[PDB]
Write an enzyme that holds these catalytic residues in place. Structure first.
Site, mmCIF file in Angstrom:
data_model
loop_
_atom_site.group_PDB
_atom_site.id
_atom_site.type_symbol
_atom_site.label_atom_id
_atom_site.label_comp_id
_atom_site.label_asym_id
_atom_site.label_seq_id
_atom_site.Cartn_x
_atom_site.Cartn_y
_atom_site.Cartn_z
ATOM 1 N N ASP A 71 -3.745 8.369 15.775
ATOM 2 C CA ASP A 71 -4.212 7.938 14.459
ATOM 3 C C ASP A 71 -4.863 6.554 14.547
ATOM 4 O OD1 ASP A 71 -4.850 8.381 11.755
ATOM 5 O OD2 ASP A 71 -2.882 7.668 11.032
ATOM 6 N N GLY A 80 0.808 -1.219 0.000
ATOM 7 C CA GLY A 80 0.000 0.000 0.000
ATOM 8 C C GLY A 80 0.833 1.257 0.000
HETATM 9 C C1 551 Z 1 -0.779 -0.770 3.310
HETATM 10 O O1 551 Z 1 -0.746 -0.765 4.756
HETATM 11 C C2 551 Z 1 -0.796 -1.951 5.345
HETATM 12 O O2 551 Z 1 -0.314 -2.946 4.881
HETATM 13 C C3 551 Z 1 -1.532 -1.874 6.656
HETATM 14 C C4 551 Z 1 -2.817 -2.657 6.508
HETATM 15 O O3 551 Z 1 -2.865 -3.680 5.833
HETATM 16 N N1 551 Z 1 -3.873 -2.170 7.151
HETATM 17 C C5 551 Z 1 -5.217 -2.696 6.971
HETATM 18 C C6 551 Z 1 -5.782 -3.257 8.257
HETATM 19 C C7 551 Z 1 -7.288 -3.186 8.324
HETATM 20 N N2 551 Z 1 -7.817 -3.687 9.593
HETATM 21 C C8 551 Z 1 -9.248 -3.982 9.517
HETATM 22 C C9 551 Z 1 -9.880 -4.200 10.869
HETATM 23 C C10 551 Z 1 -10.611 -5.344 11.136
HETATM 24 C C11 551 Z 1 -11.217 -5.537 12.363
HETATM 25 C C12 551 Z 1 -11.112 -4.579 13.370
HETATM 26 C C13 551 Z 1 -11.782 -4.846 14.674
HETATM 27 C C14 551 Z 1 -12.943 -5.611 14.737
HETATM 28 C C15 551 Z 1 -13.560 -5.865 15.948
HETATM 29 C C16 551 Z 1 -13.032 -5.359 17.116
HETATM 30 C C17 551 Z 1 -11.885 -4.602 17.073
HETATM 31 C C18 551 Z 1 -11.262 -4.345 15.865
HETATM 32 C C19 551 Z 1 -10.378 -3.429 13.088
HETATM 33 CL CL1 551 Z 1 -10.262 -2.157 14.259
HETATM 34 C C20 551 Z 1 -9.763 -3.244 11.867
#
Ligand code: 551
Ligand code: 551
Ligand code: 551
Ligand code: 54G
Length: 328
Positions: A155, A45
Site C-alpha cells: 500500500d 483522519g
Molecule cells: C489521517 O492519516 C494520517 O494522519 C496519515 C497522514 O497524515 N498521511 C498524509 C501524508 C502525506 N504525505 C505527502 C507526501 C509528501 C512528499 C512525498 C515525497 C516527496 C518527494 C520524494 C519522496 C516522497 C510523499 Cl511520497 C508523500
C-alpha cells in the site's frame, strides 16, 4: 496449464528459513496496554475501517498517534500487529508503541510514535531536485528493510509516507495491507490504492512479490518529478491498466502476459486499444524541468516496467546514480 510461476529475485526464502513464530500471525498472542494511559486530542483522519487520533500519553506527557480499528476481520488485525512488532526499529518504519482496547465498545487500537506531518500542498511547490532524491532514498531504506524481513507493504502511496520536513524525518505507515512473502503463494490482488496498483494486480497475476512496492514507488517518483498527480489516472481497475499502456505501450504489455501465460480478462477487449511506447522526456514541461534529469529518467524507466522481475529491487535502486548526491 495456467499461469507460469514466479518468485522474488531477492529475499526469496527469508520466511522459509525462519520458525513459524515469526510469520504465523494467527498464533500470535496479543497483550493489551492500559487505554487509560491515553487521552485523545484530535481527529487526524479516517480510513475504511479506522479512525486516527492524535493523543497524549498521560504517564510521560508525550504525544502519540492512536489508530482505532473497526474489527471487521480479526485475522487482519493480528497480521498488522505481528508485522509491526517484527519491523519495530527498522529505518523509517513507523514504531508501534502499544496496543490497547476499549472494553465498553469492544474496539482495538494501535498506538504509534508521533509524527508531525508537514502539509504537502505547501511542500510540493518548495521541494527541490535534491529534496526528492533525499526522501526517495529514505523510502527505499524502509522498503529494503521490510523486504529483507520477508514483508511486502502492498500500500505504498503518498498518504502512507509521513514527512516532518523541519526535522528531515520520514516514516512509512499503515501496515494494514502488508503481508508475509512466501515463494509460490497466490495472493489476493485487491490490495494497494488504484493509482498505485502494479500491472500484476490489474491482470490478476496472483504470484506477486516485493517488486509490487517498487512499482508503487515508481508511480510516486513520476508524480513528484513531473508534477502530475496521480501519474496514471485510471477511473476503475480496468481503465488503470489502459492508463499505464498509454505510457508503456501495448507491445511490452503483450510480452509480459505471454511470459507468464496470463489470460487477459475479456473486459480489456474493447478498452485496451493499441498504444506506442512513450519516451519519458515527453512528460517534461516548464513547470517540472527543474526536477528532471537524465539520471531521474533512467531510474524511473527501471522501476516502471510491466515485468515485475525486471524492476530494480530496493537495494539495486539505492545503488543507482540518481542517489550519488545523497548520504547513504
Ligand atoms: C489521517 O492519516 C494520517 O494522519 C496519515 C497522514 O497524515 N498521511 C498524509 C501524508 C502525506 N504525505 C505527502 C507526501 C509528501 C512528499 C512525498 C515525497 C516527496 C518527494 C520524494 C519522496 C516522497 C510523499 Cl511520497 C508523500
Ligand atoms: N501464510 C501461508 C504460509 C505460511 C507458511 C508457509 C511456510 C513457511 C516455511 C516453511 C513451510 C511453509 C507457507 Cl509456504 C505459506
Ligand atoms: C484518562 C484517560 C481515559 N481513557 C480515555 C480513552 C478511552 C478510550 C480509548 C479507546 C481505546 C480503544 C478503542 C477505542 C477507544 C482511548 Cl485510546 C482512550
Ligand atoms: C503515525 C500514523 C498515522 C496514521 C496512521 O494511519 C498510521 C498507521 O496506520 O500506521 C500511523
Amino acid at each position: 496449464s495456467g499461469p507460469v510461476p514466479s518468485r522474488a529475485r531477492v529475499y526469496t526464502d527469508v520466511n522459509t528459513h525462519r520458525p513459524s513464530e515469526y510469520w504465523d500471525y494467527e498464533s500470535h498472542v496479543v497483550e493489551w496496554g492500559n487505554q487509560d494511559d491515553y487521552q485523545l486530542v484530535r481527529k487526524l483522519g479516517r480510513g475504511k475501517y479506522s479512525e486516527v487520533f492524535e493523543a497524549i500519553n498521560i504517564t510521560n506527557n508525550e504525544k502519540v498517534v492512536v489508530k482505532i480499528l473497526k474489527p471487521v476481520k480479526k485475522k487482519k488485525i493480528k497480521r498488522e500487529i505481528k508485522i509491526l512488532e517484527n519491523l519495530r526499529g527498522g529505518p523509517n518504519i513507523i514504531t508501534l508503541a502499544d496496543i490497547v482496547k476499549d472494553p465498553v465498545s469492544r474496539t482495538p487500537a494501535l498506538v504509534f510514535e508521533h509524527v508531525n506531518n508537514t502539509d504537502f500542498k505547501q511542500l510540493y511547490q518548495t521541494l527541490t531536485d535534491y529534496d526528492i532524491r533525499f526522501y526517495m532514498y529514505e523510502i527505499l531504506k524502509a522498503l529494503d528493510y521490510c523486504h529483507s524481513m520477508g514483508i511486502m507493504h502492498r500500500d505504498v502511496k503518498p498518504h502512507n509516507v509521513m514527512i516532518d520536513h523541519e526535522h528531515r524525518k520520514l516514516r512509512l505507515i499503515d501496515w494494514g495491507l502488508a503481508e508475509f512473502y512466501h515463494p509460490g503463494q497466490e495472493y489476493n490482488v485487491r490490495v494497494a490504492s488504484r493509482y498505485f496498483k502494479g500491472p500484476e494486480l490489474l491482470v490478476d497475476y496472483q504470484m506477486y512479490d516485493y517488486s509490487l512496492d517498487m512499482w508503487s514507488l515508481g508511480c510516486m517518483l513520476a508524480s513528484m518529478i513531473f508534477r502530475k498527480e496521480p501519474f496514471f489516472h485510471g477511473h476503475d481497475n480496468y481503465d488503470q491498466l489502459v492508463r499505464i499502456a498509454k505510457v508503456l505501450g501495448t507491445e511490452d504489455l503483450y510480452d509480459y502476459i505471454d511470459k507468464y501465460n496470463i489470460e487477459l480478462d475479456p473486459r480489456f477487449n474493447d478498452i485496451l486499444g493499441r498504444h506506442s511506447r512513450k519516451r519519458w522526456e515527453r512528460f517534461v514541461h516548464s513547470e517540472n524541468q527543474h526536477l528532471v534529469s537524465p539520471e531521474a529518467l533512467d531510474f524511473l524507466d527501471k522501476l516502471l516496467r510491466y515485468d515485475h522481475q525486471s524492476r530494480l529491487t530496493a537495494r539495486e535502486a539505492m545503488e543507482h546514480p540518481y542517489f550519488y548526491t545523497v548520504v547513504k
